[PDB]
Amino acid sequence: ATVKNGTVEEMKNCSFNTTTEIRDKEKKEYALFYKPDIVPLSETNNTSEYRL
Amino acid sequence: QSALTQPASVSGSPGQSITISCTGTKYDVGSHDLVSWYQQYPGKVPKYMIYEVNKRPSGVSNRFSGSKSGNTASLTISGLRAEDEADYYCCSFGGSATVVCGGGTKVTVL
């Protein structure tokens, strides 16, 4: 969570692939989410992969 | 860069009250009243005399005072003498989370 350096302890910076309005030109996007809204995807040590 | 608008010099005589002026956008001068003023003898550090548009720090003489109307401000000095011969600067709350400062005004007590 390198917002302006440091770490914001509540909000994670995440990026995801968006199926755009044309549906065959999907693009990368980024957003900041709250950690109550973010769940780890698997119990393994792939801890950079998350879900709503 | 913008660096506000500030006159090059000011004139006056002893006994007169004068104003040191600064003018800018409504974000930088008027959206918040966080306007401070700094003063520079030649070869010295900038000195702290006005904060929060019209308040004074430790030990500063009460002859100095501030003012603000809309998107301008002026350090108002009552009763000049020759000791005020220096350069003057204003600084204020910048655009996003920054501080912005002016171009410098020389005090010329004739």
Next chain:
Amino acid sequence: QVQLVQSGAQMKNPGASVKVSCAPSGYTFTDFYIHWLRQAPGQGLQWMGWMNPQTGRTNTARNFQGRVTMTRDTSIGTAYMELRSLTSDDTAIYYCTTGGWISLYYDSSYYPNFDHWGQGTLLTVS
């Protein structure tokens, strides 16, 4: 009150990058925001950046993006300036100032209350 000290002199050449120190004395370093400003000879005062020593966050001016970076120290306590991609026009005096008070409940970074000033340093590049 309290007093900051800085580096003695910085005579350099273009493309070398510059470190400036700022050691406080009289007060606890991890209490106030630290601002960095620049003053050219015969030109008005330029504001360069601010940094929170409690959290390590920092911001600079929009014209100074990428060229200006800053860090902190916890063991002794000082503020580190490093200037990158510099040219001859940065021949100027450089000032380290003590800003507003750090509170966890409201933002106090952009308060231009430079209450204490260091002696500055000279950067001469030609």
Next chain:
Amino acid sequence: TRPNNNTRKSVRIGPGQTFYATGDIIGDIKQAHCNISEEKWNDTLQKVGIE
């Protein structure tokens, strides 16, 4: 309050319809908190104990 100067970001999700999220944060990070005056709260809880 929320003393954290947030910024809204707009993403287009599918045809015609949009979605709003949190983009950058400007300024320093501060904690969301709420305040109650202490003497009124102690007075109120003592009166609740009275009742």
